[PDB]
């Protein structure tokens, strides 16, 4: 995250850290005790699915304080429409091997109904994006979780104000002055929207022209397009073999 601030410990309790062989891979969002939403592109180079771990309740990567909860990832579900190495349909639904235990430091973000998300949440101007990604373009990643408030743009406006292929499965948010953006290492993390006292999942950190590149905004997966796809999968039984490609729609 470029140009944000530290998220006070426990104030982003849905944030997930994904690790592969102990190394930071991407972020994610907890939506219930066994399900995490992340970005499909995070998994383009995985060779050994058994080395994927999700951590909840994380804050400062330099220390263990006892609020962290780690789980193996039992399933990584990607839409059939996602093509590795590209941007469209950049979403993954991850099933944890065992549920996390909800605590003051581990709480799911609400996955909203589509109508509500399209009719109401899509018009809330500002939303929060968070992660342990790079603090600057071509810079080191963060040791404490960072958070940034970004304003959403209608796609026609993003295209006009930019100087990009933004589909109906994406939306732009952020700033074009190169000061504030999500960045490498934040991919998969939440774009969370507040409405009447509760926070909801509206986007997934997906892609951008570099990070905080002047003239460009951050691009997020438009979660509202996938609500029914996600809900159906959460009602399904797990299948052998971590990776599952599931038809979309």
């Amino acid at each position: 995250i470029v140009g944000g601030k530290v998220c006070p410990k426990g104030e982003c309790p849905w944030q997930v850290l994904l690790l592969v062989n102990g190394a930071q891979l991407c972020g994610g969002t907890l939506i219930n005790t066994i399900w995490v939403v992340s970005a499909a592109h995070c998994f383009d180079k995985i060779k050994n699915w058994r080395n994927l771990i999700a951590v909840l309740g994380e804050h400062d990567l330099s220390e263990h304080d006892g609020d962290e909860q780690s789980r193996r990832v039992a399933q990584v579900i990607i839409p059939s429409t996602y093509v590795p190495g590209t941007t469209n349909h950049d979403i993954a639904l991850l099933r944890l091997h065992q549920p996390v235990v909800l605590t003051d430091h581990v709480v799911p973000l609400c996955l909203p109904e589509r109508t509500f998300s399209e009719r109401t949440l899509a018009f809330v101007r500002f939303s929060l994006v968070s992660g342990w990604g790079q603090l600057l373009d071509r810079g080191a990643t963060a040791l404490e979780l960072m958070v940034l408030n970004v304003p959403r743009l209608m796609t026609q406006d993003c295209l006009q104000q930019s100087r990009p292929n933004i589909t109906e499965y994406m939306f732009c948010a952020g700033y074009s002055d190169g000061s504030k953006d999500s960045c490498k290492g934040d991919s998969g993390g939440p774009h969370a929207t507040h409405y009447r006292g509760t926070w909801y999942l509206t986007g997934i950190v997906s892609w951008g022209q570099g990070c905080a590149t002047v003239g460009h905004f951050g691009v997020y997966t438009r979660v509202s397009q996938y609500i029914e796809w996600l809900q159906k999968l959460m009602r399904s039984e797990p299948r052998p073999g971590v990776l599952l490609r599931a038809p979309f729609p």
């Binding site: 104030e11 709480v107 973000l109 109508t115 009719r119 009447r196 509760t198």
Partner: protein, 58 residues
């Protein structure tokens, strides 16, 4: 009322019905109050709320 305008007055989810009818609903872990619009948690850690802040204001 209608869901497309001001969320139909609902705190959370809204469904339109045949006629001038509307029904608000709440996510799991919440229940709908008798006002027909507000949602109140029914569990300790409902989704989308931040415990350290809910207690800071409790």
């Amino acid at each position: 009322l209608i869901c497309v305008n001001e969320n139909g007055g609902c705190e959370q989810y809204c469904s339109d019905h045949t006629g001038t009818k509307r029904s608000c609903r709440c996510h799991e872990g919440y229940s709908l109050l008798a006002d027909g619009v507000s949602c109140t948690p029914t569990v300790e850690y409902p989704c989308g709320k931040i415990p350290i802040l809910e207690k800071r204001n409790a």
